[PDB]
Ligand SMILES: [Zn+2]
């Protein structure tokens with residue numbers, strides 16, 4: 001196994017996957033690394049199994065159909081994995097915890113949103129469809145773009161949204177387009 005957390009790239013108290021060489025901090029893995037379970041298989045491995053069990057699941061899909069899916073166990077897992085892929089980028093630090101808004105010339109968003117709030121919402125099974133998770137994730141970056149206006153810091157929202165969107169298209173096998 002690797003000697004650093006796959007998510008935050010630091011050492012520490014690491015749980016090792018039994019079926020691949022990745023390792024994780026307890027609360028860096030999503031869901032949080034399970035108490036017992038020997039062997040234990042990481043989210044990466046669980047996602048790869050879904051694909052291997054249903055190879056056709058990799059055929060292209062329309063985004064509108066994916067969004068309307070109910071949050072059955074496989075879709076719950078796919079959203080958890082997508083969330084984890086965003087935390088894998090170090091720039092997610094800006095979006096992880098609860099924001100506050102006091103900048104001359106700007107007003108805070110009407111509906112603040114942040115990664116740890118989406119993480120709790122997934123853990124608490126608050127989303128009934130994929131659409132609820134995706135809308136909160138896109139709202140994080142939209143709020144950031146609107147608040148920061150012409151400040152160059154706006155770019156951090158574009159960057160992390162691009163990580164989200166690329167991983168959304170990969171994990172949910174969205175049909176490739178020009
Ligand atoms: Zn970590």
Ligand SMILES: [Zn+2]
Nearest residue numbers: 017020042045
């Ligand atoms: Zn694994």
Ligand SMILES: [Zn+2]
Nearest residue numbers: 053054055056
């Ligand atoms: Zn099948």
